Design a protein around this ligand. Structure first.
Ligand SMILES: CC(C)C(=O)Nc1nnc(S(N)(=O)=O)s1
Ligand SMILES: CC(C)C(=O)Nc1nnc(S(N)(=O)=O)s1
Ligand SMILES: [Zn+2]
Length: 257
């Protein structure tokens, strides 16, 4: 089964998921000088005030904070998007060391981690149908650098001890994802894919320019999670990131000059 190890990591995924070598794969390097400002791009509309978190799950690849997506409670609109995209979950990708961990890079720079807030286009009714469509998902990507603590992340950090191993979940209600955003909503956007199998080419990527700061202690706690299930040899959940993929016939657009 796919993972992030030497024998099942990103270089192997194409054997089970040939789209891994497709025309709109993610992540990519964001070459800031080549991205073009698009004055027709609208400000992002992030409406998370009514978000209803439910649960946090270690799925053996990352941890997912899941939301009630049975109504328009937490939605992403505007920016490059047509229509309304409902928040379903967020998760992170992170490194074994502070110098790596992000999936997208900025002028080849790797951040310590990257947050993905996953949303699906409500015109397709459910996430499973949305992933079959070229405009099915909008993923809001936010870089993490190590510095000051992010207070809004701490409730996530503190529950990780209860979901150490693959398949463990915990109740995770009343978490406000607004506490994970940076000040600015300036962004880059391009058409891409899920960065994990099945690697479907269904994502409008919206990557914020401003990283959030998290403390070394916060990211250290991410690195104490396990890829393995309970009672199996311990494999630290680190370096669960896919490297940058060829941009191919795509232009990255910037919302800002
Ligand atoms: C892309 C594929 C493997 C996939 O993940 N499909 C899902 N369909 N519903 C989901 S759920 N429980 O988050 O709402 S995931
Ligand atoms: C579980 C389901 C709802 C889901 O969200 N699946 C994703 N698989 N890769 C994603 S990513 N790293 O491109 O944001 S999200
Ligand atoms: Zn992700």
């Amino acid at each position: 089964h796919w993972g992030y190890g030497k024998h099942n990591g990103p270089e192997h995924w194409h054997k089970d998921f040939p789209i891994a070598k497709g025309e709109r794969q993610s992540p990519v390097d964001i070459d800031t000088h080549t991205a073009k400002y698009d004055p027709s791009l609208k400000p992002l509309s992030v409406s998370y005030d009514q978000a209803t978190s439910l649960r946090i799950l270690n799925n053996g690849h990352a941890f997912n904070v899941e939301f009630d997506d049975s109504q328009d409670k937490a939605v992403l609109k505007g920016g490059p998007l047509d229509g309304t995209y409902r928040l379903i979950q967020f998760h992170f990708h992170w490194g074994s060391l502070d110098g790596q961990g992000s999936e997208h890079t900025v002028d080849k720079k790797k951040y310590a981690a990257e947050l993905h807030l996953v949303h699906w286009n409500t015109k397709y009714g459910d996430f499973g149908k949305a992933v079959q469509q070229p405009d099915g998902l909008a993923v809001l990507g936010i870089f993490l650098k190590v510095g000051s603590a992010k207070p809004g992340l701490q409730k996530v950090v503190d529950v990780l001890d209860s979901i150490k191993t693959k398949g463990k979940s915990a109740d995770f209600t009343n978490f406000d994802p607004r506490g994970l955003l940076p000040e600015s909503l300036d962004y880059w956007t391009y058409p891409g894919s899920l960065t994990t199998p099945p690697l479907l080419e269904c994502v409008t990527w919206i990557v914020l320019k401003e990283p959030i700061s998290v403390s070394s202690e916060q990211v250290l706690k991410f690195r104490k999670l396990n890829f393995n299930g309970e009672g199996e040899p311990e494999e630290l959940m680190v370096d669960n990131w896919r490297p940058a993929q060829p941009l191919k016939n795509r232009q990255i657009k910037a919302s800002f000059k």
